Amino acid sequence: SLWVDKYRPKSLNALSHNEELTNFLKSLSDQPRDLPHLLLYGPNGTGKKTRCMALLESIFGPGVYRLKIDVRQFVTASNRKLELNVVSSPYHLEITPSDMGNNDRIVIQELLKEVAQMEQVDLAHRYKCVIINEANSLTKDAQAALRRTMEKYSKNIRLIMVCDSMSPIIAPIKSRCLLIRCPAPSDSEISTILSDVVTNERIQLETKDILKRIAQASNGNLRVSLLMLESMALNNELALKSSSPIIKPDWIIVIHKLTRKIVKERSVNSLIECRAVLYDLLAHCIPANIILKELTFSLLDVETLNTTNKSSIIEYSSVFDERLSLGNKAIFHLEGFIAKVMCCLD
Amino acid sequence: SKENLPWVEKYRPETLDEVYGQNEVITTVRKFVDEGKLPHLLFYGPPGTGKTSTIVALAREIYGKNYSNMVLELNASDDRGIDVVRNQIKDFASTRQIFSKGFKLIILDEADAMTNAAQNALRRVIERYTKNTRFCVLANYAHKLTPALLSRCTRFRFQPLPQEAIERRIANVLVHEKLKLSPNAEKALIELSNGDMRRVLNVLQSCKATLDNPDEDEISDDVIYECCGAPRPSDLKAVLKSILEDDWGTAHYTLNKVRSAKGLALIDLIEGIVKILEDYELQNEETRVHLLTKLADIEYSISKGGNDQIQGSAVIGAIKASFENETV
Amino acid sequence: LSLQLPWVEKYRPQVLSDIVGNKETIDRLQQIAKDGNMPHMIISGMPGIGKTTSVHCLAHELLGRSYADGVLELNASDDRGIDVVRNQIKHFAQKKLHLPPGKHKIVILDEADSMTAGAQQALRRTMELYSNSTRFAFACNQSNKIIEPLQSRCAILRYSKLSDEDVLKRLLQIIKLEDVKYTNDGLEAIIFTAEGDMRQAINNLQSTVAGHGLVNADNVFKIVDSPHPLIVKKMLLASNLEDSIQILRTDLWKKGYSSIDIVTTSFRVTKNLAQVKESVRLEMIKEIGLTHMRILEGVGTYLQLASMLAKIHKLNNKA
Amino acid sequence: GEQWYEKFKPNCLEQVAIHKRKLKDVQEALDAMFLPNAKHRILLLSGPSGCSKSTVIKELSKILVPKYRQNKVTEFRGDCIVNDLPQMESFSEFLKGARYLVMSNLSLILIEDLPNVFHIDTRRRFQQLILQWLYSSEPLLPPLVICITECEIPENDNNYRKFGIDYTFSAETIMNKEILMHPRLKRIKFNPINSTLLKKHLKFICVQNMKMLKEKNKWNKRQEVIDYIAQETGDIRSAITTLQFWATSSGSLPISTRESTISYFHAIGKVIHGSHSTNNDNEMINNLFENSNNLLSKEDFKLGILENYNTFNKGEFSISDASSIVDCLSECDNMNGLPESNEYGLREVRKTFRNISKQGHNHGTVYFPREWKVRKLQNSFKVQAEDWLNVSLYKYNAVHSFRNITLEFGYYAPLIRKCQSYKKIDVVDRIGGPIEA
DNA sequence: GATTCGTATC
DNA sequence: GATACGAATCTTTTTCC
Numbered sequence A: 001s002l003w004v005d006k007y008r009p010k011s012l013n014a015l016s017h018n019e020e021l022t023n024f025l026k027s028l029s030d031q032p033r034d035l036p037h038l039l040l041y042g043p044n045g046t047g048k049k050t051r052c053m054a055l056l057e058s059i060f061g062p063g064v065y066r067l068k069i070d071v072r073q074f075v076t077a078s079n080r081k082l083e084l085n086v087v088s089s090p091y092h093l094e095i096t097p098s099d100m101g102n103n104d105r106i107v108i109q110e111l112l113k114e115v116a117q118m119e120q121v122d123l124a125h126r127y128k129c130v131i132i133n134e135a136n137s138l139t140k141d142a143q144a145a146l147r148r149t150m151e152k153y154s155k156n157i158r159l160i161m162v163c164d165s166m167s168p169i170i171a172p173i174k175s176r177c178l179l180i181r182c183p184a185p186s187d188s189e190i191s192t193i194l195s196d197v198v199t200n201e202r203i204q205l206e207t208k209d210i211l212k213r214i215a216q217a218s219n220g221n222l223r224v225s226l227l228m229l230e231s232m233a234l235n236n237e238l239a240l241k242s243s244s245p246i247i248k249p250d251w252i253i254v255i256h257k258l259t260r261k262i263v264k265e266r267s268v269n270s271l272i273e274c275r276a277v278l279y280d281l282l283a284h285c286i287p288a289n290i291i292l293k294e295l296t297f298s299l300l301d302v303e304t305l306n307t308t309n310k311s312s313i314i315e316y317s318s319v320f321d322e323r324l325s326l327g328n329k330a331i332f333h334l335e336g337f338i339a340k341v342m343c344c345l346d
Numbered sequence B: 001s002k003e004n005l006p007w008v009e010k011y012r013p014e015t016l017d018e019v020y021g022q023n024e025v026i027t028t029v030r031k032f033v034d035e036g037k038l039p040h041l042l043f044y045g046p047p048g049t050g051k052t053s054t055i056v057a058l059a060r061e062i063y064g065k066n067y068s069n070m071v072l073e074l075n076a077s078d079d080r081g082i083d084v085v086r087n088q089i090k091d092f093a094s095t096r097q098i099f100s101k102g103f104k105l106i107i108l109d110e111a112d113a114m115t116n117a118a119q120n121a122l123r124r125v126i127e128r129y130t131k132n133t134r135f136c137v138l139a140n141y142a143h144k145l146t147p148a149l150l151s152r153c154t155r156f157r158f159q160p161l162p163q164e165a166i167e168r169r170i171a172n173v174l175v176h177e178k179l180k181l182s183p184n185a186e187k188a189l190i191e192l193s194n195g196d197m198r199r200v201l202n203v204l205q206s207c208k209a210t211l212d213n214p215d216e217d218e219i220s221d222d223v224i225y226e227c228c229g230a231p232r233p234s235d236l237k238a239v240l241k242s243i244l245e246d247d248w249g250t251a252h253y254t255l256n257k258v259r260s261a262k263g264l265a266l267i268d269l270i271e272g273i274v275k276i277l278e279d280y281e282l283q284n285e286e287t288r289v290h291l292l293t294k295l296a297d298i299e300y301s302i303s304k305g306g307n308d309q310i311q312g313s314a315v316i317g318a319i320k321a322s323f324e325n326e327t328v
Numbered sequence C: 001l002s003l004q005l006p007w008v009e010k011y012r013p014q015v016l017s018d019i020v021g022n023k024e025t026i027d028r029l030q031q032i033a034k035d036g037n038m039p040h041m042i043i044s045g046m047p048g049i050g051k052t053t054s055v056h057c058l059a060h061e062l063l064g065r066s067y068a069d070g071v072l073e074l075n076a077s078d079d080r081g082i083d084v085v086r087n088q089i090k091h092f093a094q095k096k097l098h099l100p101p102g103k104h105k106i107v108i109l110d111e112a113d114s115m116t117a118g119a120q121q122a123l124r125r126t127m128e129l130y131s132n133s134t135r136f137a138f139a140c141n142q143s144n145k146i147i148e149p150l151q152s153r154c155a156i157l158r159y160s161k162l163s164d165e166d167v168l169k170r171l172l173q174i175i176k177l178e179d180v181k182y183t184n185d186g187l188e189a190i191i192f193t194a195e196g197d198m199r200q201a202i203n204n205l206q207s208t209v210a211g212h213g214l215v216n217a218d219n220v221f222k223i224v225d226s227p228h229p230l231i232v233k234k235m236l237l238a239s240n241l242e243d244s245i246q247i248l249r250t251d252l253w254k255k256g257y258s259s260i261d262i263v264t265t266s267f268r269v270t271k272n273l274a275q276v277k278e279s280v281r282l283e284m285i286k287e288i289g290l291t292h293m294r295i296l297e298g299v300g301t302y303l304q305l306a307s308m309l310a311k312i313h314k315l316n317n318k319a
Numbered sequence D: 001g002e003q004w005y006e007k008f009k010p011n012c013l014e015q016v017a018i019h020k021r022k023l024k025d026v027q028e029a030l031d032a033m034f035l036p037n038a039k040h041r042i043l044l045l046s047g048p049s050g051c052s053k054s055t056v057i058k059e060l061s062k063i064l065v066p067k068y069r070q071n072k073v074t075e076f077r078g079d080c081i082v083n084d085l086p087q088m089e090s091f092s093e094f095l096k097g098a099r100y101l102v103m104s105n106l107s108l109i110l111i112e113d114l115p116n117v118f119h120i121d122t123r124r125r126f127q128q129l130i131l132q133w134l135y136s137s138e139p140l141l142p143p144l145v146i147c148i149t150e151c152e153i154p155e156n157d158n159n160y161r162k163f164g165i166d167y168t169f170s171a172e173t174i175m176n177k178e179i180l181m182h183p184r185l186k187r188i189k190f191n192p193i194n195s196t197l198l199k200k201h202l203k204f205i206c207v208q209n210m211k212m213l214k215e216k217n218k219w220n221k222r223q224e225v226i227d228y229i230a231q232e233t234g235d236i237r238s239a240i241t242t243l244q245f246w247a248t249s250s251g252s253l254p255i256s257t258r259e260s261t262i263s264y265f266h267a268i269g270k271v272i273h274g275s276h277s278t279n280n281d282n283e284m285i286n287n288l289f290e291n292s293n294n295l296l297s298k299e300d301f302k303l304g305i306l307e308n309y310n311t312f313n314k315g316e317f318s319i320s321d322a323s324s325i326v327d328c329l330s331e332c333d334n335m336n337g338l339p340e341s342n343e344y345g346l347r348e349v350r351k352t353f354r355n356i357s358k359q360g361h362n363h364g365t366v367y368f369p370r371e372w373k374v375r376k377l378q379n380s381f382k383v384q385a386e387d388w389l390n391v392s393l394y395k396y397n398a399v400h401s402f403r404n405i406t407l408e409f410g411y412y413a414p415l416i417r418k419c420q421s422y423k424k425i426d427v428v429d430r431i432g433g434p435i436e437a
Numbered sequence E: 001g002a003t004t005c006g007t008a009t010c
Numbered sequence F: 001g002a003t004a005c006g007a008a009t010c011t012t013t014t015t016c017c
């Protein structure tokens, strides 16, 4: 197993990076009966899902981690077959409605209204939680069913949905949930976690600075930092030195190369080459929102650009991110952003 | 049991003499009835202006007793696809008339909800069986009607109700319900109606419900605004004066205080300020462009929801900024 | 309640001599009537300019006493699927009927623009197999909706919009045959509000006669409404913003016109609008599209329309 | 008495308005499928309406089939509603009875009028049956000639399901990928008859109608009208019908011919480079929308404009113009298929390319957008990610979201498994393949 | 509609 | 011999039979 999963804290006492959030979770889990609906929001990779699973273990005891996966079939208006995977353990349910596209409304209706009405009497009645990963990916139609589903059937079901940047979450849903903020760990805590991992894994470490380098390069991403740690562990024969290169994902390198090309050569042919690169990126299912975000924040790291160019770049990035939110085809807005940048740089 | 109904479908006219406002349409359809010739009518206008009432009263006047078997009424609530038009409408307007004689009526309420295929099929039914059947097409949006369908129909336009028609209907309702109404309340009701009679009847029902003793107490403009939850004209004038003249902090404080005094919404204030400013004589012309564009953007954003304080401060800032061109 | 046919169907011409408008096309149709060698033809144009009447008059003048079983008039109101086409049309064309020497059966297909494509292919087979005994006459509003394989076999006749003189002449005929009192300006107003439509002109004249009697400008304009596309064009071409706003308010908002109707008419007017630069025209189209989106999402107030006019004036006034 | 295109049908292949190369390339093929043990099982002719496909097949089967008859044409009749037989079985019966035309019987098959292909069930049956003919294990079969008229289906009641036959009736949208790409299938696309052949043949029709033409004194004008007709259309039957209508008439009727549809790349070129004889951009775009609204009202057209706007002067124009074009396209993408969006986008593209167009420009070649390639790559990525997730539960209990798979686990997990592979799990290669440049 | 290449004709 | 012309290519994934 990966080091992200091998050393996942299985208890509320095993979480050792936020503490105050752990105290709040313990306050919530002291009396599970009056548990409200929760909304965990924070940067990607901080550990929100681990906190949800730790809270569930605190409430329902060990056994929430025995996940059974089954495929359940759906039917749309046009009568096509859709197969959603429902990672189901006892005492709780996991659903990723974003596995289907705009067709997640039928899931949020059928699958969730099925369990909301179905009680859990076995003379004693318990409430079974339901976890909704990536609550942002719901299409404002699943959320509209969600709000009344959880308002009226609160006696039998509890909703714990995880997300980052909960702005695309509608006001009725946000008003119906307890907002739990999960901040990202500081570099010291990431380095401490990596130190514990390497100690339990018998990796030879030259100096502790190469863990602070991993923490800084991951930008507060525990999973990303642990994956980097395992990568350089298995690419250096389990002996890491300060000469060991900081390794970054291929698409990040491609975006940085695209930034270099955009800054260097600014012509229509350069625009066409950038379009080819963007199409290659989209062929790897990298969402266009994060493509634009990484492109913007790599173009703002170039030192040859003055303040006027950077301000223009950030303004165009905001405009075209709003356009991308309301759009249907990503390539139009990505190409428009790149063209505007290449027209403003010169 | 007409006392067990909402005021809107309790004062629905039963005869053509009770349809106020549309003098010309009513006179022309009465002449059509008297002369014995009725063309294919098309009633078009805003909602709640007397289209369904007029057509039903006209059909009742033409067929006083045979109305059940002489008029086929269809609306958006009934499926009206290609098959319905082909079968039901054609078979109704293809058979001989009941009792002695006459012409059959086919009323299409809310015909803008029909697909283009249904209208294209309907056009030849209209042109082919016109000897013994006449059509009435009721529509709020004429752009959803095929140009051929508009061609083969006689167009009657229902204007929004004028002041006099609403005043007469209000007087009738007040006499019927033993209610009182101050002249200022009458003016407030006229302005909030915006050419709709359903709005007037609903507001009047809520005003009768608000009163503690609807047999002794009157209805003033205060009751009108309290029940309908709208800003008083004085509040709108005060907010606009604070925005235009006073500084930023006191303008923001005045806006918030006026809003919180009666729980007013920002969209109502926006519409009131726009109505007030439309009478303003601007001298830079770019003052109007900026006002209209910024306020339309703010209204759209409000319609999508969001931060109320941010939108209110945006309204104040948009007004003060636009009126900077006025002095230029 | 009584018996009186409306003037539109009471005065529908029965002979080709009573049809006004496209003189060359009607003369050609009369020639076809006399010689009798009618080709497959497609008739297209605006609504209410004498397309259906021309077809039916040609059929009558070509078949005479054999019209009863010589024409097969199928229309949009009738089912015209692939099976209906196959069975009915094939059986009608296979019907051996002795006709005069230079005569053929006629298959009138009114509203052929609303026919399914597979039915058009079956019509292709029937047209190319039984052409020696029967001929096809398509009546449509636009010839685009008829597939190219069918237009290949037909002689395309295009009916132009009726000129004011022809509609005036037909109106005068109907007036001097129904005995209505009129004024010259009244008939001019009827012509102006008809906008090249004979059916609309007849309907408006009958409505004015029934409602008020004498047909003058005042009665006509108090019963009929000036075409709102012209008002939209007047408001879009206004010099200053105040005049455009006033026109919009007092001529479309107080008159009870839907905001979606105003926006759609504005787009249609902008598409066909000379004396404006291409950049200005496309900017106006963009602003109209944005306002149309706002109307479609529910924000259909007068403020949105005023803002659209303000943006149009910004773009066209260098403001 | 009879239609001119019916009484003036060519009696020989020398009288047919076809190109010399086209006639040679159809004759050589037809001989190729005629010889026993022929490589080409069937022949597919495609093109516009009235491009003299059926006529050349008539004459070629008239002077070819007799050569190989041991000691004519057979056409399918979709109108044959035979008793006891469902409609979907009509073509089955026809093909089963028509395959008995090999020995002592020889007749080339011409499927001129196809069965109803707009119904999905019988269209699929047509595909399966013609594939069975193509993949037949029979020792030999009579040659199969199928003529397809490429026509655009105009808009109708808003219900479109096939997406292929519902926008264009062509060989690509009828026949599937397997059928067209087949070693034993031969396809010869046809082209509209050029103005030279039309002029010559209209002159022949006139010189065969001199008396009547001379009777109505129209022979002193026939040349200009013949040139006009030849320039207006590339349809021989429609040209002859229009000529007959003009000749038999006795007035000043305008000469009107059927309007031919505009292709995809034709519309793209008209938007980019403008149109000759129409210096008004407004009227050209207006006519483009009225006549070809089916083609212009699509996302594929905006994608084509985006993909091909760089072919103007081989990308040798200002970056400001390119930024304006892509900005307008992105704005149009935020209007959700409103007509104003397409109108504004096309108008802006045309205006931008008009303000920079001058003489001395050497443009490139347009291409179809590569979006379908990206969709196939994304589908392959989805399959690989599903496989990785499936492996990532039963091997070791762990649930990972798809976003994480696309971001980190599509690169770091294969890297770990490759390091584990070298110091030794099913999925060892990178998800979606490696990235380049 | 544009480019390129190849014909055919005058 | 010039030149206009012509051919190929530039394309893949509510209602009816």
Ligand SMILES: Nc1ncnc2c1ncn2[C@@H]1O[C@H](COP(=O)(O)OP(=O)(O)OP(O)(O)=S)[C@@H](O)[C@H]1O
Residues within 6 Å of the ligand: B007, B008, B009, B010, B011, B012, B013, B018, B019, B020, B021, B022, B046, B047, B048, B049, B050, B051, B052, B053, B054, B139, B140, B169, B197, B198, B201
């Ligand atoms: N001219 C009128 N005179 C009297 N009451 C009217 C008049 N117009 C509308 N009303 C009132 O408005 C009520 C509903 O209006 P209707 O005319 O039935 O609806 P409508 O005019 O068809 O508008 P739409 O298009 O159906 S929303 C009636 O029951 C009356 O009480």
Ligand SMILES: Nc1ncnc2c1ncn2[C@@H]1O[C@H](COP(=O)(O)OP(=O)(O)OP(O)(O)=S)[C@@H](O)[C@H]1O
Residues within 6 Å of the ligand: B148, B151, C007, C008, C009, C011, C012, C013, C018, C019, C020, C021, C046, C047, C048, C049, C050, C051, C052, C053, C054, C140, C141, C170, C198, C199, C202
């Ligand atoms: N040229 C004309 N001369 C005389 N009456 C005409 C003429 N054109 C139309 N009409 C009148 O219009 C009515 C019939 O018009 P139609 O020819 O049926 O309309 P249309 O041309 O078929 O348009 P569509 O597409 O069917 S709506 C009758 O009342 C005719 O008297």
Ligand SMILES: Nc1ncnc2c1ncn2[C@@H]1O[C@H](COP(=O)(O)OP(=O)(O)OP(O)(O)=S)[C@@H](O)[C@H]1O
Residues within 6 Å of the ligand: C148, C149, C150, C152, D004, D005, D006, D008, D009, D010, D015, D016, D017, D048, D049, D050, D051, D052, D053, D054, D055, D056, D112, D147, D149, D201, D236, D237, D240
């Ligand atoms: N000189 C000519 N050369 C060829 N065909 C001619 C000529 N003169 C008249 N025709 C006629 O033109 C018609 C052309 O038909 P074809 O193009 O062969 O069939 P088609 O290609 O299937 O047309 P569609 O698509 O079915 S409308 C035939 O009916 C010919 O008889």
Ligand SMILES: Nc1ncnc2c1ncn2[C@@H]1O[C@H](COP(=O)(O)OP(=O)(O)O)[C@@H](O)[C@H]1O
Residues within 6 Å of the ligand: A003, A004, A005, A007, A008, A009, A014, A015, A016, A017, A018, A043, A044, A045, A046, A047, A048, A049, A050, A051, A162, A193, A222, A223
């Ligand atoms: N307190 C902690 N101590 C050790 N590891 C942690 C802690 N919190 C999170 N992690 C690690 O972070 C990794 C990814 O976190 P995750 O829960 O996936 O974040 P998110 O909920 O944002 O997806 C997990 O594999 C887990 O092992």
Ligand SMILES: [Mg+2]
Residues within 6 Å of the ligand: B051, B052, B109, B110, B138
């Ligand atoms: Mg109604």
Ligand SMILES: [Mg+2]
Residues within 6 Å of the ligand: C051, C052, C053, C110
């Ligand atoms: Mg007609």
Ligand SMILES: [Mg+2]
Residues within 6 Å of the ligand: D053, D054, D055, D112
């Ligand atoms: Mg043919």
